[PDB]
Design a protein around this ligand. Structure first.
Ligand SMILES: OC[C@H]1O[C@H](O[C@@H]2[C@@H](O[C@H]3[C@@H](O)[C@H](O)[C@@H](CO)O[C@H]3O)O[C@H](CO)[C@@H](O)[C@@H]2O)[C@@H](O)[C@@H](O)[C@@H]1O
Ligand SMILES: [Ca+2]
Ligand SMILES: [Ca+2]
Ligand SMILES: [Cl-]
Ligand code: NA
Ligand code: NA
Length: 258
């Protein structure tokens, strides 16, 4: 036929063509989360949008390295140094440092998350921006692990609305990756998710991440159509645009027929 038929039952993921000045990287907003609260982050409504009803702590823009790898301090005989969780032992020490005098159960202040001074032990953050596929095909996003709770959403009307990156969060719970901490503890059922994307369109991307205590971990990757994997550093793939709610043609409901 002269034209492609389109994805079945309007199945294509909504994308965007923002006309304004493109900025490299994602915006990261930080919100209050209570130390050792092991329940709030288990609710889908909280992880999709309820986080923004808590106090906003601040923000950083232009972030291309988006994985989280926060290690608490070990106050050791030779000074205070971050302890990789796999090197923690006993009650407690850190391999190569001896016994640690400090508690694993208190808040710690650091700039480890995106250079922003906060409590990485206990915080929720929202990463927003647009993913620009260089290749048409299936993209598989993944979290290698999650400590404590996280979601990833892709698409207009799923992550956020086209040309409206800076607005309060939308209520969609149709997550691309549901990494929400189960009520029974243990691992979420599935921490990949796949999206079919068309080259050159901008796909809204949202990651919401929470830590309640001590270590924080969220190693983010994407497998491209060509089979290669991009991990941690998404430079060249993620961008931000200032809101333009007046750009009438911004939303592309079905990129295969655009
Ligand atoms: O999944 C929850 C967190 O687990 C780890 O945090 C540690 C965890 O400690 C456990 C025992 O070792 C402690 O003696 C006991 C005392 O509170 O708690 C158990 O759950 O939980 C503590 C908080 O209660 C933390 O202080 C410990 O660091 C770690 O993987 C965290 O990143 C997880 O969020
Ligand atoms: Ca919409
Ligand atoms: Ca934790
Ligand atoms: Cl040691
Ligand atoms: Na770590
Ligand atoms: Na430290």
């Amino acid at each position: 036929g002269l034209v492609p038929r389109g994805s079945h039952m309007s199945g294509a993921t909504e994308a965007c063509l923002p006309a304004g000045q493109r900025k490299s990287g994602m915006n990261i907003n930080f919100y209050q989360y209570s130390l050792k609260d092991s329940s709030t982050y288990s609710n889908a409504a909280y992880m999709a949008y309820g986080y923004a009803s808590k106090t906003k702590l601040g923000s950083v823009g232009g972030q291309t390295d988006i994985s989280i790898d926060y290690n608490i301090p070990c106050v050791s005989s030779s000074g205070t140094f971050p302890c990789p969780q796999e090197d923690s032992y006993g009650n407690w020490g850190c391999k190569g440092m001896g016994a640690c005098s400090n508690s694993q159960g208190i808040a710690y202040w650091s700039t480890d998350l995106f250079g922003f001074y906060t409590t990485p032990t206990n915080v929720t953050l929202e990463m927003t921006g647009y993913f620009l596929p260089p290749q048409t095909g299936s993209y598989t996003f993944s979290f290698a692990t999650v400590d404590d709770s996280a979601i990833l959403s892709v698409g207009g009307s799923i992550a956020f609305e086209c040309c409206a990156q800076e607005q309060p969060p939308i209520t969609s719970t149709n997550f691309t990756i549901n990494g929400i901490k189960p009520w029974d503890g243990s691992l979420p059922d599935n921490i990949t998710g796949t999206v079919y994307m068309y080259a050159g369109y901008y796909y809204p991307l949202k990651v919401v991440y929470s830590n309640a205590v001590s270590w924080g971990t969220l190693p983010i990757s994407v497998e491209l159509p060509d089979g290669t994997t991009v991990s941690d550093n998404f430079e060249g793939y993620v961008y931000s645009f200032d809101d333009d709610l007046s750009q009438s043609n911004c939303t592309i409901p079905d990129p295969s027929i655009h």
